[PDB]
């Protein structure tokens, strides 16, 4: 899934392959092959890099299920994980199966 290219990590990377797009890595080829490697690497790291669980509540606005991917947008929603208390009035949630 070329899902995680919309991450701080993924964009900083592309902006690198784009500085190479203008100077050395002209268009795709090298850059594309690197991104492909990134997909495998980020996916692999997520599924087996550990994790911690919790439970919470919210209010809704929109939703979109296509390609087995859910995209929500909640309003006035606060989520708490373990000790951390947090607030939010606009949160977008993208979820893959």
């Amino acid at each position: 899934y070329q899902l995680y290219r919309n991450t701080t990590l993924g964009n900083s990377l592309q902006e690198s392959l784009d500085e190479l797009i203008q100077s050395q890595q002209i268009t795709p080829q090298l850059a594309l092959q690197v991104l492909l490697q990134f997909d495998k690497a980020i996916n692999a790291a997520l599924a087996q890099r550990v994790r911690n669980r919790v439970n919470f509540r919210g209010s809704l606005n929109t939703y979109r299920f296509c390609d087995n991917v859910w995209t929500f947008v909640l309003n006035d929603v606060e989520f708490r994980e373990v000790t951390e208390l947090i607030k939010v009035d606009k949160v977008k949630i993208v979820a893959c199966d």
Binding site: S16, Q29, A41, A45, V54, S59, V91, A95
Partner: protein, 122 residues
């Protein structure tokens, strides 16, 4: 415990793509430029600290105004959540969410969960 994971992932990814760069005909200097370019953008943003940074029938127009603003949904300066779903459920206007492996950015801070359970009325 978050900057740590990121370092961890950046290291692993960089190490794991070295051969690919080499097989494609690339100087190790480029690899280091990547790491530098990468590390630097986070430091510039300043969202957290990093080790690298420190270094009628015919007309329907009779109706007037219902359909709320679509543009309200997008700001991108808001809080985005990347996660996976196990089960999403609805009854009438009651939704229940069973989520996992998620990275959250709430109020500016970064959080992670292996599982997230939520409730909301639509």
């Amino acid at each position: 415990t978050v900057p740590k994971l990121y370092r961890s992932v950046i290291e692993d990814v960089i190490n794991d793509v070295r051969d690919i760069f080499l097989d494609d005909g690339v100087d190790e200097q480029v690899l280091m430029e990547l790491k530098t370019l990468w590390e630097n953008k986070l430091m510039q943003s300043r969202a957290v600290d990093g080790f690298h940074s420190e270094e009628e029938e015919e007309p329907l127009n009779s109706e007037d105004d219902v359909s709320d603003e679509e543009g309200q949904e997008l700001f991108d300066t808001e809080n985005v959540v990347v996660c996976q779903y196990d089960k999403i459920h609805r009854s009438k206007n009651k939704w229940k969410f069973h989520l996992k492996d998620g990275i959250m950015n709430l109020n500016g801070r970064d959080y992670i969960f292996s599982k997230a359970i939520g409730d909301a009325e639509w």
